[PDB]
Amino acid sequence: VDEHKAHKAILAYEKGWLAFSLAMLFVFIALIAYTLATHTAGVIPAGKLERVDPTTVRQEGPWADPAQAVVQTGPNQYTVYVLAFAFGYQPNPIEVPQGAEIVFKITSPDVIHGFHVEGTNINVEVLPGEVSTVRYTFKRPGEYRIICNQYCGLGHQNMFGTIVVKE
């Protein structure tokens, strides 16, 4: 009869849909796991807690002198101590060589800011009291814009910075 047959077919095909759904989600998981084994994964923040005092970060330690923010830490590696604050970034510009691994260490003396480097996958929240650590290699020389993409107050829409990647 009508309803019983419709019911039976509906359920059989639904189970097929669900198995298929699952397969496709599992393939996404495999494709995500691939990203995690590549250099593209550098932009994931370090999970290690690295606490600082937002009230002295402009007076003492590696964020206190932005002209010394860029430090060579290996043969082809540079560490950059970045301050995100209301409403800008220091140093400005950040100047690095292309082809080198750049380790960004970013904190804030005030509120939460974003650090979104347009044209790249660098997109990290910056918490007062915490160091956000992310890694990236700029393959193309030139000027990249930093956008703050976390609401930080009335100056949010004009909070930009600059990275200069030297040939």
Partner: protein
């Protein structure tokens, strides 16, 4: 067979794949 429902989940599948693989491509282009 529930042909209408299958068409809906075909559109849903296509949408999901276009979205996901599109952004996957953007992710690697920006890597």
């Amino acid at each position: 067979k529930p042909k209408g429902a299958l068409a809906v989940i075909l559109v849903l599948t296509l949408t999901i794949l276009v979205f996901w693989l599109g952004v996957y491509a953007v992710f690697f282009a920006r890597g």
